[PDB]
Amino acid sequence: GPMDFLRSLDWTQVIAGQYVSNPRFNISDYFEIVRQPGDGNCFYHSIAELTMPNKTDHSYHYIKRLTESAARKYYQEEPEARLVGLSLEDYLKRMLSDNEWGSTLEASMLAKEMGITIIIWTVSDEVEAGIKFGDGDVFTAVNLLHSGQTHFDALRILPQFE
Amino acid sequence: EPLSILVRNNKGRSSTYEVRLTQTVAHLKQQVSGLEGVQDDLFWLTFEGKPLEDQLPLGEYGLKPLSTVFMNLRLRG
Numbered sequence A: 001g002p003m004d005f006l007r008s009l010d011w012t013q014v015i016a017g018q019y020v021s022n023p024r025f026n027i028s029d030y031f032e033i034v035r036q037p038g039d040g041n042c043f044y045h046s047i048a049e050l051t052m053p054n055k056t057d058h059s060y061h062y063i064k065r066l067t068e069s070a071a072r073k074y075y076q077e078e079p080e081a082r083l084v085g086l087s088l089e090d091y092l093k094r095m096l097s098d099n100e101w102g103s104t105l106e107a108s109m110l111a112k113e114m115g116i117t118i119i120i121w122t123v124s125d126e127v128e129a130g131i132k133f134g135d136g137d138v139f140t141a142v143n144l145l146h147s148g149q150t151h152f153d154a155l156r157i158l159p160q161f162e
Numbered sequence B: 001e002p003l004s005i006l007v008r009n010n011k012g013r014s015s016t017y018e019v020r021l022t023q024t025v026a027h028l029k030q031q032v033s034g035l036e037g038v039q040d041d042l043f044w045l046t047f048e049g050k051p052l053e054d055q056l057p058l059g060e061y062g063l064k065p066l067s068t069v070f071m072n073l074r075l076r077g
């Protein structure tokens, strides 16, 4: 059909609740890029942008608080926790520090804690992969753009696609 | 006895690796790190929906010739 590409994304299971896709498209053909501050909190700024209506400049602190709560429940069982290599207490001290980069590990934990679905699109703006945490689809997902290997922005589906 | 398996990267490209079932997951990660040019603490592996644990031998997971393992990126920013 016309204009319904996003309705047919194919997600392959990685583990229960995490999926990957490899659609071929340019991000800006389907999404508005909502640019976030370049500081080290950009991951949490991006989540806040898409989950907290009429937010404030540093609404991301609430998301980091939710990350703490999530980590206390889930960190020891996250496969990416093993890559970080820290005890829960040392992880929390690092994670809660100003400007400490967020990641797929916090996305995984926040999807559980908040009940949301998060998709990180990694990229030109030519998509290489989407990685999805949670079982929802792209239309109610928190869509993030990961670019330059080191930066997050928020994405919003363009109106003509719904 | 040596066998070939496949490891699929983020872009969806599979590459072939010669392994032994006695070697560890960690050592397979070192081979994948060399081929893909990504540090071994920036990805983790799965097979058939199960995370692969670094210290365990590959044979604990029932890999067979040309089994596909996923290389799952850790993305930070």
Ligand SMILES: [Zn+2]
Pocket (backbone or CB within 6 Å): A001, A002, A003, A004, A005
């Ligand atoms: Zn169509």
Ligand SMILES: [Zn+2]
Pocket (backbone or CB within 6 Å): A008, A009, A010
């Ligand atoms: Zn489909």
Ligand SMILES: [Zn+2]
Pocket (backbone or CB within 6 Å): A010
């Ligand atoms: Zn498909």
Ligand SMILES: [Zn+2]
Pocket (backbone or CB within 6 Å): A025, A026, A126
């Ligand atoms: Zn294109």
Ligand SMILES: [Zn+2]
Pocket (backbone or CB within 6 Å): A035, A036, A151, A152, A153
């Ligand atoms: Zn940006």
Ligand SMILES: [Zn+2]
Pocket (backbone or CB within 6 Å): A037, A039, A041, A042, A045
């Ligand atoms: Zn900021």
Ligand SMILES: [Zn+2]
Pocket (backbone or CB within 6 Å): A049
């Ligand atoms: Zn806004």
Ligand SMILES: [Zn+2]
Pocket (backbone or CB within 6 Å): A044, A045, A048, A049, A055, A056, A057, A058, A059, A060, A061
């Ligand atoms: Zn914010």
Ligand SMILES: [Zn+2]
Pocket (backbone or CB within 6 Å): A089, A090, A093
């Ligand atoms: Zn400590």
Ligand SMILES: [Zn+2]
Pocket (backbone or CB within 6 Å): B026, B027, B030
């Ligand atoms: Zn080794």
Ligand SMILES: [Zn+2]
Pocket (backbone or CB within 6 Å): B027
């Ligand atoms: Zn070797």
Ligand SMILES: [Zn+2]
Pocket (backbone or CB within 6 Å): B030, B040
């Ligand atoms: Zn190493």
